Design a protein around this ligand. Structure first.
Ligand code: MG
Ligand code: MG
Ligand code: MG
Ligand code: MG
Ligand code: MG
Ligand code: MG
Ligand code: MG
Ligand code: MG
Ligand code: MG
Ligand code: MG
Ligand code: MG
Ligand code: MG
Ligand code: MG
Ligand code: MG
Ligand code: MG
Ligand code: MG
Ligand code: MG
Ligand code: MG
Ligand code: MG
Ligand code: MG
Ligand code: MG
Ligand code: MG
Ligand code: MG
Ligand code: MG
Ligand code: MG
Ligand code: MG
Ligand code: MG
Ligand code: MG
Ligand code: MG
Ligand code: MG
Ligand code: MG
Ligand code: MG
Ligand code: MG
Ligand code: MG
Ligand code: MG
Ligand code: MG
Ligand code: MG
Ligand code: MG
Ligand code: MG
Ligand code: MG
Ligand code: MG
Ligand code: MG
Ligand code: MG
Ligand code: MG
Ligand code: MG
Ligand code: MG
Ligand code: MG
Ligand code: MG
Ligand code: MG
Ligand code: MG
Ligand code: MG
Ligand code: MG
Ligand code: MG
Ligand code: MG
Ligand code: MG
Ligand code: MG
Ligand code: MG
Ligand code: MG
Ligand code: MG
Ligand code: MG
Ligand code: MG
Ligand code: MG
Ligand code: MG
Ligand code: MG
Ligand code: MG
Ligand code: MG
Ligand code: MG
Ligand code: MG
Ligand code: MG
Ligand code: MG
Ligand code: MG
Ligand code: MG
Ligand code: MG
Ligand code: MG
Ligand code: MG
Ligand code: MG
Ligand code: MG
Ligand code: MG
Ligand code: MG
Ligand code: MG
Ligand code: MG
Ligand code: MG
Ligand code: MG
Ligand code: MG
Ligand code: MG
Ligand code: MG
Ligand code: MG
Ligand code: MG
Ligand code: MG
Ligand code: MG
Ligand code: MG
Ligand code: MG
Ligand code: MG
Ligand code: MG
Ligand code: MG
Ligand code: MG
Ligand code: MG
Ligand code: MG
Ligand code: MG
Ligand code: MG
Ligand code: MG
Ligand code: MG
Ligand code: MG
Ligand code: MG
Ligand code: MG
Ligand code: MG
Ligand code: MG
Ligand code: ZN
Lengths: 71, 50, 120, 86
RNA sequence: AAACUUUCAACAACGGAUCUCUUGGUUCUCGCAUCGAUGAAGAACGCAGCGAAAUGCGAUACGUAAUAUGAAUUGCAGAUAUUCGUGAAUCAUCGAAUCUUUGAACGCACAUUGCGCCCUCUGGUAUUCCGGAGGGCAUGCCUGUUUGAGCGUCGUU
RNA sequence: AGGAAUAGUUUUCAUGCCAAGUCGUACUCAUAACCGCAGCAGGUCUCCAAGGUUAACAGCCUCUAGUUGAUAGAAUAAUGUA
RNA sequence: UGCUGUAAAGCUGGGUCGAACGGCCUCUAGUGCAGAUCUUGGUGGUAGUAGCAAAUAUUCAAAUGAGAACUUUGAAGACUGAAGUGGGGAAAGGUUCCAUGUCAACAGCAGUUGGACAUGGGUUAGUCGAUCCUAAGAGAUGGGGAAGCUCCGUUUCAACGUGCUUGAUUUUUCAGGCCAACCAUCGAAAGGGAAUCCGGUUAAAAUUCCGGAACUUGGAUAUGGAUUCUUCACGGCAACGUAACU
RNA sequence: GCGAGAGACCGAUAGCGAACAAGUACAGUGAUGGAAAGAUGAAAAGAACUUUGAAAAGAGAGUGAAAAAGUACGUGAAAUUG
RNA sequence: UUGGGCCCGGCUCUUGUCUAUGUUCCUUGGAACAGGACGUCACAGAGGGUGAGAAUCCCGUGCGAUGAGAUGACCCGGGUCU
């Protein structure tokens, strides 16, 4: 997941199973003030939903990861 | 199959989570009687129910 | 657990309670980021029970406002009504059960059960 | 060839999971559950299968509401809240 | 004579009888009357700092409130937890809440997490398109309200 | 039915703006991932298809690809199986 | 170790063991086993025996390792021979996929190897399928049977539109204008069906990711062009043509 | 069902099928069918350390009243075996 | 002959709280809850726990008492207002 944070400027999040790509896009905008280029979603074998969120060129996904504080 | 329903796929997720070995710190509890997980399941040996 | 105190919460407004709830959810969000590295982080339990307390006080506070609005009214929301049993809600009221025909009321009054004794 | 060779042609489920009881007794073509009788309003149960009643009756699940009727009845179905003693 | 076979004794094996227990069962007696559209019984899926099951619970998820009591919990860890006190733990008690997807199951449907419509608010230059938040739309029947239909029928022009 | 002259119409010509939700998606598909109690010589639907010989997609040899898997070692009486 | 009793049995020496038990007068019964092709559990001889023989086939060396016929690598010899022992899929399975570690059990020899065990990782879509359509059929509703569970019936002896379209109205009222043969619904991952390709990329995903280049549907909407004074375009005998062209 | 008190009852092949994560594991397409399985010790004090072994383990040693109690756990019969 | 409404009681139920007397001496034992000696309480010598058979170590038992909550036109006794 962290290789995606660096190379493709895409953030990977665990997301609620009931939420759609419109709600995920809104949530990251309200929490972290960031614009998503797209939201690709996926339900994992363990039953949780994974979202690949690519940010627009205005944002550097690595900077956001440091801001959240997990890299 | 590759083409599976959501209701099927959610049951297969629980079957994986129920197939774990016993966490080892559980054997340290006082008056503990569980020595191992007695509900293991192999895919080839015992089939589910979907 | 510990966390926030419910008696301090009952002295707060809607705006103050909602503001503290937002702070707790980002705190829980911040903890979930740190759980990636700790990975054992017992403080998460305290914040989760803090969210439950703040949510409880908001819901309870909002329920007497509706109760005060409907106080004395004939019709109130069904979740604010008494929750006994299905059969006991269908049961006759005290007034209806004690109803009596005017013919039946005249005979009870005219001939009450007397109080007496024997051997005198 | 009515045995082993014929047993190789079993890949069409007659039953799938039931929405009421989740048992894999829902006949696909009949659209009926062979266990609980779904979608009929009443539950399938027979007096010639008393052991089947044991398997699915009050107390075999959570009783998430009947759990507390005895405890609420014992207090006369109080309305209000408990008062702290002075 | 060895070996082998058989018998016996000792010790070691195999196995779990015997003895002794028992938070279980079984039966008798005494007492009580309390499920559900205010959504039951049951099902599925989830929930713990570290849990698979049983038990408990429902996105407030081994629990929130309240009352009582009065210093724990405990396998480890850990307080931005607590101790002459609104105060640890407790299905001790319990009167306030929360109560996922469902289920008589109620918008329609369901081998699909499929497809609508209405009201209020809101975002995208929007009564109409797309998104979000909250609240609604089942059937039979009763009383009442309103809107109607019939040369069935009454008065009048 | 609605349409002009000092102005009218049209997005079936060109260009430009926004959006497209939900669920599946890994892997086996069989002489070991399915069903036959099993890693069972059985059964189980379908797509692609090189060179030589030839009537031929037959049989035999080969290219690409994939395997070299089936307890092994030593002998070679009788009676067997092929 | 013995003693007593014809006997059923009782008592006793030694060893083991560790929490209860017995004698006598009575009461009571789920009260005595060699069998029942008895029941359940456990164990033999058979017996280290039958056997582990289909699908042409292996060998040398190095590496690793305590240990190598069987693991890896190299060299060779072979086979499947495109109707494959190849490359994908449907049903069915459900994590077997990938990486790391690993040999107690399993792979009827072995095992350093594995579809085993343990720990993690992994499946990205407006365009691929679902979803939409209807097929045989299934099946609600008004109803009609049946004591009833339910059976019949699918437009049926029914007052069956949660109608639309406009001009609107901002008066959230309306004015009306048209229609209502047929019209609940479910029912196809092989029928019908709006739209995506190439190159690259992962340990494991890709018509899904990256790069580039397209397309459809719904919606909004301006400019250019087109057309009109012969108002709703011109040309061609014609077949017909067109950037448009109620 | 709820809440109690009892017994000349049974004592883990008995007593309910279930004294245990029992209507559990598991079978069957399905209706259904449905087990086995209690006992170290007062207390894990669940054997530190040394040594041989690739390891499991073994031998010393240690704990314990007892290891003639080592989770293959009280007692440990018979069949069967060295 | 006589109506109705409230307020406190009693009874019933739930729930909270409260209560006598050795751990004295010797022996065995890892542990005394065993044996012996000396006792205490007993409307309490049921039962259980605690390192083995414990009235007297602990929880309880007997005797009763009480806080809080409920509940009852249709149980009664008092008040009190019409
Ligand atoms: Mg998006
Ligand atoms: Mg995309
Ligand atoms: Mg997806
Ligand atoms: Mg995972
Ligand atoms: Mg798949
Ligand atoms: Mg199989
Ligand atoms: Mg099954
Ligand atoms: Mg079979
Ligand atoms: Mg067939
Ligand atoms: Mg069929
Ligand atoms: Mg089935
Ligand atoms: Mg329930
Ligand atoms: Mg001799
Ligand atoms: Mg009993
Ligand atoms: Mg469900
Ligand atoms: Mg206090
Ligand atoms: Mg909630
Ligand atoms: Mg629930
Ligand atoms: Mg569904
Ligand atoms: Mg659903
Ligand atoms: Mg549908
Ligand atoms: Mg109604
Ligand atoms: Mg659409
Ligand atoms: Mg694939
Ligand atoms: Mg294939
Ligand atoms: Mg294939
Ligand atoms: Mg085979
Ligand atoms: Mg085969
Ligand atoms: Mg294979
Ligand atoms: Mg067979
Ligand atoms: Mg079978
Ligand atoms: Mg075919
Ligand atoms: Mg040929
Ligand atoms: Mg060919
Ligand atoms: Mg050949
Ligand atoms: Mg062979
Ligand atoms: Mg040979
Ligand atoms: Mg011969
Ligand atoms: Mg021959
Ligand atoms: Mg003992
Ligand atoms: Mg008998
Ligand atoms: Mg016998
Ligand atoms: Mg016999
Ligand atoms: Mg036998
Ligand atoms: Mg034998
Ligand atoms: Mg032999
Ligand atoms: Mg043979
Ligand atoms: Mg061969
Ligand atoms: Mg090695
Ligand atoms: Mg071999
Ligand atoms: Mg070989
Ligand atoms: Mg080789
Ligand atoms: Mg060949
Ligand atoms: Mg051929
Ligand atoms: Mg193939
Ligand atoms: Mg397939
Ligand atoms: Mg895993
Ligand atoms: Mg592999
Ligand atoms: Mg490996
Ligand atoms: Mg082997
Ligand atoms: Mg595995
Ligand atoms: Mg899509
Ligand atoms: Mg398509
Ligand atoms: Mg789907
Ligand atoms: Mg759709
Ligand atoms: Mg769509
Ligand atoms: Mg269509
Ligand atoms: Mg039809
Ligand atoms: Mg019908
Ligand atoms: Mg009709
Ligand atoms: Mg209105
Ligand atoms: Mg359909
Ligand atoms: Mg189709
Ligand atoms: Mg198709
Ligand atoms: Mg098709
Ligand atoms: Mg490239
Ligand atoms: Mg490139
Ligand atoms: Mg590139
Ligand atoms: Mg691949
Ligand atoms: Mg458009
Ligand atoms: Mg023109
Ligand atoms: Mg009881
Ligand atoms: Mg009872
Ligand atoms: Mg009693
Ligand atoms: Mg038993
Ligand atoms: Mg024992
Ligand atoms: Mg034992
Ligand atoms: Mg013990
Ligand atoms: Mg003890
Ligand atoms: Mg040792
Ligand atoms: Mg040792
Ligand atoms: Mg030793
Ligand atoms: Mg010692
Ligand atoms: Mg001993
Ligand atoms: Mg012994
Ligand atoms: Mg012992
Ligand atoms: Mg043994
Ligand atoms: Mg012992
Ligand atoms: Mg023993
Ligand atoms: Mg013997
Ligand atoms: Mg006392
Ligand atoms: Mg001593
Ligand atoms: Mg005792
Ligand atoms: Mg004494
Ligand atoms: Mg006692
Ligand atoms: Mg005692
Ligand atoms: Mg003491
Ligand atoms: Zn069912």
């Amino acid at each position: 997941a962290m290789k995606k944070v660096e190379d493709g400027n895409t953030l990977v999040f665990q997301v609620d199973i009931k939420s759609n790509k419109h709600q995920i896009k809104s949530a990251v905008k309200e929490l972290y003030d960031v614009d998503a280029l797209y939201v690709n979603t996926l339900i994992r074998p363990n039953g949780t939903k994974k979202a690949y969120i690519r940010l627009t060129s205005d944002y550097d996904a690595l900077d956001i990861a440091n801001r959240i504080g997990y890299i | 199959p590759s083409q599976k329903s959501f209701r099927t796929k959610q049951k297969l997720a629980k079957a994986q989570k129920q197939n774990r070995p016993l966490p080892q710190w559980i054997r340290l509890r006082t008056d503990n009687k569980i020595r191992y997980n007695a509900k293991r399941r192999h895919w080839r040996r015992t089939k589910l129910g979907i | 657990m510990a966390g926030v105190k419910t008696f301090e919460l009952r002295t707060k407004s809607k705006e103050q309670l909602e503001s503290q709830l937002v702070e707790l959810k980002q705190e829980l969000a911040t903890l979930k980021v740190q759980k990636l590295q700790r990975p054992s982080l017992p403080r998460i339990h305290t914040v989760r029970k803090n969210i439950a307390r703040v949510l409880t006080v908001i819901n309870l506070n909002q329920r007497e406002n509706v109760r005060a609005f409907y106080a004395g009214k004939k019709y109130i929301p069904k979740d604010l009504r008494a929750k006994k049993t299905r059969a006991l809600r269908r049961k006759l009221t005290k007034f209806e059960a004690s109803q009596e025909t005017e013919k039946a009321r005249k005979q009870r009054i005219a001939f009450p059960q007397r109080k007496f004794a024997i051997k005198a | 060839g009515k045995g082993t060779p014929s047993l190789g042609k079993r890949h069409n489920k007659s039953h799938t999971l039931c929405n009421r009881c989740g048992r894999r007794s829902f006949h696909v073509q009949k659209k009926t559950c062979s266990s609980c009788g779904y979608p009929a309003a009443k539950m399938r149960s027979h007096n010639w299968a008393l052991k089947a009643k044991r398997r699915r009756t009050t107390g075999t699940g959570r009783m998430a509401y009947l759990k507390h009727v005895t405890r609420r009845f014992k207090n006369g179905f109080q309305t209000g809240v408990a008062k702290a003693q002075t």
